[PDB]
Amino acid sequence: AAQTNAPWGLARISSTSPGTSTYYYDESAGQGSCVYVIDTGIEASHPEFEGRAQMVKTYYYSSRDGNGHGTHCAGTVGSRTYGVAKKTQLFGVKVLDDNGSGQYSTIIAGMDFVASDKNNRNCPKGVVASLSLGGGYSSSVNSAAARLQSSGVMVAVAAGNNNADARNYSPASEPSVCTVGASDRYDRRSSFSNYGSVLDIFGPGTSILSTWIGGSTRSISGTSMATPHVAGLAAYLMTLGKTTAASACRYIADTANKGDLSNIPFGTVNLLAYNNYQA
């Protein structure tokens, strides 16, 4: 399959040389898998979700996305004109607030929920969980990410936007989950992407077009936008039979493009997410 004139992020992933504008993916497009987006929620009625995105839990007075961030990530994961896994199932877990923030005590509650809510759903091809949120250590948050991973969910989290070593930021520093860094269009590490040895893989994160609230779209940047990219890939590969949730992140890094990125500190992996598609 091939989506022409696509968002560079999607293109860069089904390509081996940057500067290309086509996304080549297997028609299966992640059908049969699930991706819980733990953010500010998803605007589930957005036409791009084709009725495949649904809210599932909230921790605030309302359940809808009145910020946009969450929807934007949910879109990159699996939305018709912008997502990696275009036929996946998206579940919304609102742990953040409309101003973008949220207490660790409840971020944790959110991760514990996906761990068991996954057991009542029908996702034969595996479950992925995207966490485009973070903060700045907490042995408790890391710990929750790990539990989530232990139960059989591929956890993908953001490295952070402080242009610092990710080891001081919690979701990121947990070794068991997949910590995503951000790269920009000229194969350069985004100016703001956290690095370090805890990082696992790099994904498109600067100037990423995606869906927004009010049935709209818009470009924004950050390791936030990179996380759903590999979350999408993780699901895409999982329904394809290539990897299992427990071992996905390792497969993604084993099969990634090596040494194509620049401005990568010594000690940080130089790997870009990549789906290995061949007609």
């Binding site: 953010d39 500010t40 910020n67 946009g68 961030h69 934007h72 953040l96 607030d97 101003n99 973008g100 923030s101 949220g102 485009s132 949120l133 973070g134 953001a158 952070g160 936007n161 703001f192 927004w212 818009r218 924004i220 940047s221 950050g222 390791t223 936030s224």
Partner: peptide
């Protein structure tokens, strides 16, 4: 909640 659109 990481970053930048109308915002986090």
């Amino acid at each position: 909640g990481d970053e930048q659109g109308e915002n986090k």
